[PDB]
Coordinates of C-alpha atoms in Angstrom, one line a residue:
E1 CA 16.7 88.0 104.6
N2 CA 18.6 91.3 105.0
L3 CA 19.2 93.6 102.0
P4 CA 22.4 95.6 101.7
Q5 CA 24.3 92.6 100.3
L6 CA 22.9 92.8 96.7
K7 CA 22.8 96.5 97.3
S8 CA 26.6 97.0 97.6
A9 CA 27.1 94.4 94.9
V10 CA 25.1 96.7 92.5
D11 CA 26.4 100.1 93.7
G12 CA 29.8 98.8 92.6
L13 CA 28.6 98.6 89.0
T14 CA 30.2 101.7 87.5
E15 CA 28.1 101.5 84.4
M16 CA 24.6 102.0 85.8
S17 CA 23.6 105.6 86.5
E18 CA 22.2 106.7 89.9
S19 CA 18.7 106.6 88.5
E20 CA 19.2 103.0 87.4
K21 CA 21.0 101.6 90.4
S22 CA 18.5 102.4 93.1
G23 CA 15.6 101.6 90.7
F24 CA 16.8 98.0 90.2
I25 CA 16.2 98.0 94.0
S26 CA 12.4 98.3 93.9
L27 CA 12.2 95.3 91.7
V28 CA 14.8 93.2 93.7
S29 CA 13.3 94.6 96.9
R30 CA 9.7 93.6 96.0
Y31 CA 10.6 90.4 94.1
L32 CA 12.3 89.3 97.3
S33 CA 9.3 90.6 99.4
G34 CA 6.3 89.4 97.4
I35 CA -3.6 88.9 92.8
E36 CA -5.6 86.2 94.6
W37 CA -8.0 84.2 92.4
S38 CA -11.1 84.3 94.6
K39 CA -11.3 88.1 94.2
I40 CA -11.2 88.7 90.5
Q41 CA -14.0 90.6 88.7
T42 CA -15.1 91.6 85.2
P43 CA -15.0 95.4 84.6
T44 CA -18.1 97.2 83.3
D45 CA -18.6 99.3 80.2
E46 CA -18.2 102.3 82.5
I47 CA -14.6 101.1 82.7
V48 CA -14.0 99.9 79.1
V49 CA -15.4 102.6 76.9
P50 CA -16.9 101.6 73.5
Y51 CA -14.8 103.2 70.9
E52 CA -17.8 103.8 68.5
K53 CA -19.6 105.6 71.2
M54 CA -17.1 108.4 71.7
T55 CA -17.5 111.9 70.4
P56 CA -15.3 112.5 67.4
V57 CA -13.7 115.8 66.6
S58 CA -15.4 118.3 64.3
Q59 CA -13.8 119.4 61.0
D60 CA -12.9 122.7 62.7
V61 CA -9.1 122.4 62.5
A62 CA -8.9 124.8 65.4
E63 CA -10.3 122.0 67.6
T64 CA -7.9 119.5 66.1
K65 CA -5.0 121.9 66.6
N66 CA -5.9 122.4 70.2
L67 CA -5.9 118.7 70.9
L68 CA -2.9 117.9 68.8
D69 CA -1.2 120.6 70.8
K70 CA -1.3 118.7 74.0
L71 CA -0.1 115.4 72.5
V72 CA 3.3 113.8 72.3
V73 CA 4.1 110.7 70.2
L74 CA 6.4 108.2 71.9
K75 CA 7.6 104.9 70.4
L76 CA 9.0 102.1 72.5
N77 CA 12.2 101.5 70.5
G78 CA 13.7 98.9 72.8
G79 CA 13.8 95.7 70.9
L80 CA 16.0 94.0 68.3
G81 CA 14.7 92.1 65.3
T82 CA 16.5 88.9 66.3
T83 CA 13.2 87.1 66.5
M84 CA 12.8 87.5 62.8
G85 CA 16.3 86.5 61.9
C86 CA 17.2 90.1 61.3
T87 CA 20.0 92.2 62.7
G88 CA 19.2 95.7 64.0
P89 CA 16.2 97.4 65.7
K90 CA 12.8 95.7 65.3
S91 CA 11.6 99.0 63.7
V92 CA 14.4 99.2 61.1
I93 CA 12.9 96.2 59.3
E94 CA 11.0 97.1 56.0
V95 CA 7.3 96.9 56.1
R96 CA 6.3 97.6 52.5
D97 CA 7.8 99.4 49.6
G98 CA 11.3 99.7 51.1
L99 CA 10.1 101.9 54.0
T100 CA 10.9 100.9 57.6
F101 CA 8.9 101.1 60.8
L102 CA 11.0 104.1 61.8
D103 CA 10.5 105.4 58.2
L104 CA 6.7 105.4 58.2
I105 CA 6.7 106.7 61.8
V106 CA 8.4 109.9 60.7
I107 CA 6.0 110.0 57.7
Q108 CA 2.6 109.8 59.5
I109 CA 3.4 112.3 62.2
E110 CA 4.5 114.7 59.4
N111 CA 1.1 114.3 57.6
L112 CA -0.8 115.0 60.8
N113 CA 1.1 118.2 61.4
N114 CA 1.0 118.9 57.7
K115 CA -2.8 118.8 57.7
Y116 CA -3.1 120.8 60.9
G117 CA 0.0 123.0 61.2
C118 CA 0.7 121.8 64.7
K119 CA 4.1 120.2 65.6
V120 CA 3.4 117.0 67.5
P121 CA 6.8 115.7 68.7
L122 CA 8.2 112.1 68.2
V123 CA 10.0 110.7 71.2
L124 CA 11.6 107.2 70.9
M125 CA 12.4 105.2 74.0
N126 CA 15.6 103.3 73.4
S127 CA 17.7 100.8 75.3
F128 CA 21.3 99.8 75.0
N129 CA 20.4 97.4 72.2
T130 CA 19.0 100.1 69.9
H131 CA 20.1 103.5 71.2
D132 CA 23.3 104.4 69.4
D133 CA 22.2 102.8 66.2
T134 CA 19.0 104.8 66.3
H135 CA 20.8 108.0 67.0
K136 CA 22.7 107.3 63.8
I137 CA 19.7 106.3 61.8
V138 CA 17.5 109.2 62.7
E139 CA 19.9 111.6 61.1
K140 CA 18.0 110.5 58.0
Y141 CA 15.2 112.7 59.3
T142 CA 17.4 115.8 59.4
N143 CA 15.2 117.9 57.2
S144 CA 11.9 116.2 58.2
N145 CA 9.2 118.4 59.8
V146 CA 9.2 116.7 63.1
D147 CA 11.3 117.1 66.3
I148 CA 12.3 113.6 67.1
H149 CA 13.7 113.1 70.6
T150 CA 15.3 109.8 71.7
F151 CA 16.3 108.7 75.2
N152 CA 17.9 105.5 76.6
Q153 CA 15.7 103.7 79.1
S154 CA 17.2 102.2 82.2
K155 CA 19.8 99.4 81.9
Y156 CA 19.7 96.7 84.6
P157 CA 22.0 93.9 85.5
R158 CA 20.7 90.4 84.8
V159 CA 21.0 88.3 88.0
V160 CA 22.7 84.9 88.2
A161 CA 20.0 82.8 89.9
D162 CA 22.1 80.4 92.0
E163 CA 24.4 82.9 93.8
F164 CA 21.7 85.5 93.1
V165 CA 24.2 88.4 92.7
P166 CA 24.6 90.8 89.7
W167 CA 26.3 89.0 86.7
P168 CA 28.6 92.0 85.6
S169 CA 30.1 91.9 89.1
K170 CA 31.4 88.4 88.4
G171 CA 32.9 90.4 85.5
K172 CA 30.2 90.0 82.8
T173 CA 30.2 93.7 81.8
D174 CA 29.8 93.1 78.0
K175 CA 26.3 93.4 76.5
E176 CA 25.4 89.9 77.6
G177 CA 25.6 90.9 81.3
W178 CA 22.6 93.3 80.9
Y179 CA 18.9 93.0 80.2
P180 CA 16.1 95.4 79.0
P181 CA 13.7 95.2 82.0
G182 CA 10.5 95.1 80.0
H183 CA 8.4 97.9 78.6
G184 CA 6.8 98.7 81.9
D185 CA 10.0 100.7 82.3
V186 CA 8.6 103.3 79.8
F187 CA 7.3 105.5 82.6
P188 CA 10.2 106.0 85.0
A189 CA 12.4 106.2 81.9
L190 CA 10.4 108.9 80.2
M191 CA 10.7 110.9 83.4
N192 CA 14.4 109.9 84.1
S193 CA 15.0 111.6 80.7
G194 CA 14.1 115.1 81.8
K195 CA 12.0 115.3 78.6
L196 CA 8.5 115.0 80.2
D197 CA 9.1 118.0 82.4
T198 CA 10.0 119.8 79.2
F199 CA 6.9 118.5 77.4
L200 CA 4.7 119.3 80.5
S201 CA 5.8 123.0 80.5
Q202 CA 5.2 123.0 76.7
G203 CA 1.5 122.6 77.0
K204 CA 1.8 118.9 76.4
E205 CA -0.7 116.9 78.6
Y206 CA -0.8 113.4 77.1
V207 CA 1.3 110.8 75.4
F208 CA 0.1 108.1 73.1
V209 CA 2.2 104.9 73.5
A210 CA 2.5 102.0 71.1
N211 CA 4.9 99.3 69.9
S212 CA 7.1 100.5 67.1
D213 CA 5.8 97.5 65.1
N214 CA 2.0 98.0 65.5
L215 CA 1.1 99.6 62.1
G216 CA -2.3 100.5 63.4
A217 CA -1.1 102.7 66.3
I218 CA -2.2 105.9 64.6
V219 CA -3.2 109.0 66.5
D220 CA -6.9 109.0 67.2
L221 CA -8.0 112.6 67.9
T222 CA -11.3 111.2 69.3
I223 CA -9.7 109.1 72.0
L224 CA -7.7 112.1 73.0
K225 CA -10.8 114.4 73.0
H226 CA -12.5 112.0 75.3
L227 CA -9.7 111.8 77.8
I228 CA -9.8 115.5 78.3
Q229 CA -13.6 115.2 78.8
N230 CA -13.8 112.6 81.6
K231 CA -10.3 113.6 82.8
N232 CA -9.0 110.1 82.5
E233 CA -5.4 109.8 83.6
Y234 CA -4.9 106.5 81.9
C235 CA -6.5 105.0 78.8
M236 CA -5.7 101.6 77.4
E237 CA -6.8 100.6 73.9
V238 CA -8.2 97.1 74.0
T239 CA -9.9 94.9 71.4
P240 CA -11.9 91.7 71.3
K241 CA -9.8 88.5 71.7
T242 CA -9.3 86.1 68.8
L243 CA -7.9 82.6 68.8
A244 CA -4.5 84.2 68.1
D245 CA -5.0 86.1 71.3
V246 CA -5.9 83.4 73.9
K247 CA -3.2 83.9 76.6
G248 CA -3.2 87.7 76.1
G249 CA -3.4 90.2 79.0
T250 CA -6.8 91.5 79.7
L251 CA -8.6 94.2 81.7
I252 CA -10.4 93.4 85.0
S253 CA -11.8 95.3 88.0
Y254 CA -9.8 94.1 91.0
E255 CA -10.7 95.5 94.4
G256 CA -12.8 98.3 92.8
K257 CA -9.9 99.4 90.6
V258 CA -9.0 98.8 86.9
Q259 CA -6.1 96.5 86.3
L260 CA -4.3 94.5 83.6
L261 CA -4.0 90.8 84.3
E262 CA -1.2 88.8 82.5
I263 CA -0.3 85.1 82.7
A264 CA 1.9 86.6 85.4
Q265 CA -0.9 86.6 88.0
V266 CA -2.8 83.3 87.3
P267 CA -1.9 79.9 89.0
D268 CA -1.5 76.7 87.0
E269 CA -4.7 75.3 88.4
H270 CA -6.5 78.3 86.9
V271 CA -4.9 78.9 83.5
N272 CA -7.8 77.0 82.0
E273 CA -10.4 79.5 83.2
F274 CA -7.9 82.3 82.4
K275 CA -7.7 81.0 78.8
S276 CA -11.5 80.9 78.6
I277 CA -12.3 83.7 76.1
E278 CA -16.0 83.4 77.1
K279 CA -15.0 84.8 80.5
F280 CA -12.3 87.3 79.5
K281 CA -13.3 89.1 76.2
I282 CA -10.7 91.7 75.2
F283 CA -6.9 92.1 75.4
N284 CA -4.2 94.8 75.6
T285 CA -2.7 96.2 72.4
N286 CA -0.3 98.2 74.5
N287 CA -1.7 101.2 72.7
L288 CA -1.8 103.4 75.8
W289 CA -2.8 107.1 76.3
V290 CA -1.4 108.7 79.5
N291 CA -1.7 112.1 81.1
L292 CA 1.8 113.7 81.6
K293 CA 1.4 115.4 85.0
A294 CA -0.1 112.2 86.4
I295 CA 3.1 110.4 85.3
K296 CA 5.6 112.9 86.9
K297 CA 3.5 112.8 90.0
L298 CA 3.5 109.1 90.4
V299 CA 7.2 108.7 89.4
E300 CA 8.4 111.5 91.6
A301 CA 6.3 110.1 94.4
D302 CA 8.1 106.8 93.8
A303 CA 4.5 105.5 93.4
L304 CA 4.6 102.9 90.5
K305 CA 4.7 99.4 91.9
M306 CA 4.3 97.1 88.9
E307 CA 4.2 93.3 89.4
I308 CA 7.6 91.9 88.8
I309 CA 7.8 89.7 85.7
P310 CA 10.5 87.3 87.1
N311 CA 11.7 86.0 83.7
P312 CA 14.6 83.5 83.8
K313 CA 16.9 82.9 80.9
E314 CA 20.0 80.6 80.3
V315 CA 23.1 82.3 78.9
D316 CA 26.1 80.1 78.0
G317 CA 25.0 77.6 80.6
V318 CA 24.6 80.4 83.2
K319 CA 21.0 80.5 84.4
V320 CA 20.0 84.2 84.9
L321 CA 17.0 86.3 85.9
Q322 CA 15.8 89.4 84.1
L323 CA 13.5 91.3 86.4
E324 CA 10.8 93.0 84.3
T325 CA 7.5 94.8 84.2
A326 CA 4.8 95.7 81.7
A327 CA 3.6 99.2 80.7
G328 CA -0.1 98.3 80.7
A329 CA 0.4 97.5 84.3
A330 CA 0.7 101.2 85.4
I331 CA -3.1 101.6 84.6
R332 CA -4.1 101.1 88.3
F333 CA -2.1 104.0 89.7
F334 CA -3.9 106.6 87.6
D335 CA -7.0 108.6 88.5
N336 CA -10.1 107.8 86.5
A337 CA -8.0 105.2 84.6
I338 CA -10.1 103.8 81.8
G339 CA -9.6 101.6 78.7
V340 CA -11.3 101.9 75.4
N341 CA -12.4 98.9 73.3
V342 CA -11.6 99.6 69.6
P343 CA -11.7 98.0 66.2
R344 CA -8.7 95.7 65.4
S345 CA -7.5 97.9 62.6
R346 CA -5.5 99.6 65.4
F347 CA -3.7 96.4 66.4
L348 CA -1.7 95.5 63.2
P349 CA 1.7 94.5 64.5
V350 CA 4.6 92.7 62.8
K351 CA 5.9 90.0 65.1
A352 CA 7.0 87.5 62.4
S353 CA 7.5 86.9 58.7
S354 CA 3.9 85.6 58.5
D355 CA 2.8 89.2 59.2
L356 CA 5.1 90.6 56.6
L357 CA 3.3 88.4 54.0
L358 CA 0.1 90.1 55.1
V359 CA 1.2 93.7 54.8
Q360 CA 3.4 93.2 51.8
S361 CA 0.6 91.5 49.8
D362 CA -2.5 92.8 47.9
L363 CA -4.5 92.8 51.1
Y364 CA -2.9 96.2 51.9
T365 CA -1.4 99.3 50.3
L366 CA 0.6 102.3 51.4
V367 CA -1.5 105.5 51.1
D368 CA 0.4 108.5 52.6
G369 CA 1.7 106.8 55.8
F370 CA -1.1 104.4 56.3
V371 CA -1.1 100.6 56.0
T372 CA -4.4 100.7 54.1
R373 CA -6.5 97.5 54.0
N374 CA -7.9 96.6 50.6
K375 CA -11.7 97.2 50.6
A376 CA -12.2 94.3 48.2
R377 CA -11.5 92.0 51.1
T378 CA -15.0 90.6 51.7
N379 CA -14.6 88.8 55.0
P380 CA -13.8 91.3 57.8
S381 CA -11.1 88.9 59.1
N382 CA -7.6 88.5 57.9
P383 CA -6.4 85.1 56.7
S384 CA -4.4 83.1 59.3
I385 CA -0.8 82.2 58.3
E386 CA 1.3 79.2 59.4
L387 CA 4.9 79.3 57.9
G388 CA 7.6 77.0 59.2
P389 CA 11.2 77.7 60.5
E390 CA 12.3 77.7 56.8
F391 CA 10.5 81.1 56.6
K392 CA 11.4 82.6 60.0
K393 CA 14.5 84.6 58.9
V394 CA 13.2 87.5 56.8
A395 CA 16.1 87.1 54.4
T396 CA 15.0 83.6 53.6
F397 CA 11.4 84.6 53.7
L398 CA 11.8 87.2 50.9
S399 CA 13.9 84.8 48.8
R400 CA 11.2 82.0 49.2
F401 CA 8.8 84.4 47.5
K402 CA 9.8 85.7 44.0
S403 CA 6.7 87.9 44.5
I404 CA 4.1 88.0 47.3
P405 CA 1.0 86.0 46.3
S406 CA -2.4 87.6 46.3
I407 CA -4.3 86.6 49.5
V408 CA -7.2 89.0 49.4
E409 CA -9.4 86.0 48.8
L410 CA -7.3 83.7 51.0
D411 CA -8.9 82.2 54.2
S412 CA -6.0 80.1 55.4
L413 CA -2.5 79.0 54.5
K414 CA -0.5 76.2 56.0
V415 CA 3.2 76.1 55.0
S416 CA 5.9 73.7 56.3
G417 CA 9.1 72.2 54.8
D418 CA 11.5 73.3 52.1
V419 CA 8.9 75.3 50.0
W420 CA 9.5 78.1 47.5
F421 CA 7.1 80.4 45.7
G422 CA 7.1 81.7 42.1
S423 CA 5.6 85.0 41.0
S424 CA 2.0 86.2 40.4
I425 CA 0.6 83.2 42.4
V426 CA -3.0 83.5 43.7
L427 CA -4.2 81.9 46.9
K428 CA -7.9 81.4 47.8
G429 CA -9.8 79.7 50.7
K430 CA -7.9 77.1 52.6
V431 CA -4.4 76.1 51.3
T432 CA -1.6 73.9 52.5
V433 CA 2.0 73.3 51.3
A434 CA 4.6 70.8 52.5
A435 CA 7.6 68.9 51.1
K436 CA 8.6 65.5 52.4
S437 CA 11.8 63.9 53.9
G438 CA 14.7 65.4 51.9
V439 CA 12.1 66.8 49.5
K440 CA 12.0 70.3 48.1
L441 CA 9.0 72.0 46.4
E442 CA 8.7 75.1 44.2
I443 CA 5.3 76.3 43.3
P444 CA 5.5 77.8 39.7
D445 CA 4.6 81.3 38.6
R446 CA 1.0 82.0 37.6
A447 CA -0.2 79.2 39.9
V448 CA -3.7 79.6 41.3
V449 CA -3.7 77.3 44.4
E450 CA -7.3 76.9 45.5
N451 CA -8.4 74.5 48.3
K452 CA -5.5 72.1 48.4
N453 CA -3.1 70.5 50.9
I454 CA 0.1 70.1 48.9
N455 CA 1.9 67.0 50.3
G456 CA 4.3 66.2 47.4
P457 CA 5.5 67.1 43.9
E458 CA 2.9 64.6 43.0
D459 CA 0.4 67.5 43.2
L460 CA 1.1 69.7 40.1

């Protein structure tokens, strides 16, 4: 019903830039305008390329140099660590040995250029929640041998659902009036920066995208080599789905084209089949490799048309809407868009404290910018972890562990209630811990908990 209304309401927002104001239009335009089930299809291997079948690079550093010369390293740096009870960027948390996500990031790129002499650039995509703080943090890399760029993605106004007008217009101009429109915004933002054009002219042809908290997102020269062979404009790293990845976004062939399918395309009556991992086998790591010229072309041609992720939220009793999109969703707009199915050692992200237990234990070590998995670990799978809200805030997490217990032998751990952990504890097989009503527990140092379901102090 009409359109200039919401338009003038936004154009009056002095904050937003010209590249941000009209943009919020496509999303509002479409969302207000409008993937059918009976047409879905499972892609072939021709679409999803077996990692282990690709040609690796030779030892000839000249070849490595050539490839590493066309690559840029971008990190989505738009996200706070609020989910883990921590203030600051998600990447400023400490992974292992006092080093933060942004800290190892600047480390690994340096070791790749150190070993090959090239100078692969680091470009962090920020947002209003992490931009200025990042700019301040990165000064720590003043003498580092990497040119780290940063840019602020688009800022969009949340929408108050009822009246459906921009919230800042009603005067909500503080930080609560705005919302990071999803990571799908990585493409028009990289271009809105003016940095891609730069990179393009600089011999740069591809960009490897990954979450700032996926420790496995390391540059794979092989994947890059391949892209230049088949001339793939888009390449998504995917991996086999596990029980921890049921509702995850997968890859499908829809109307003869590759496409990501999130829970934002499947009806209620179909979620069951959707969640059937026997039907859909792999998921999206977000590890994405994208040809640069192809980006510019599609952004300058106002081509991208990602499915709007509605996303409603309540704020101070005000029900609002954050219109967002996903990056993996750009895969359909790219020529010879593929995806590569790789080992899970490339999808090691930190989403909660339960993952910090993992990477901070004996199951892993830091070896020259590399969250190295202990080879002693027999089973190929990592132990599952189930800590309660008592362990959600990293600060409390660390304190509830005088030292991180060995888990290299661990198969599973259940942890609920007011539980504390001494030092040099060892965990094997299946293990449970839980205090009772108004009860508190504290597992003593040197404890070797082996196949137990701790339900009370009455359990040594």
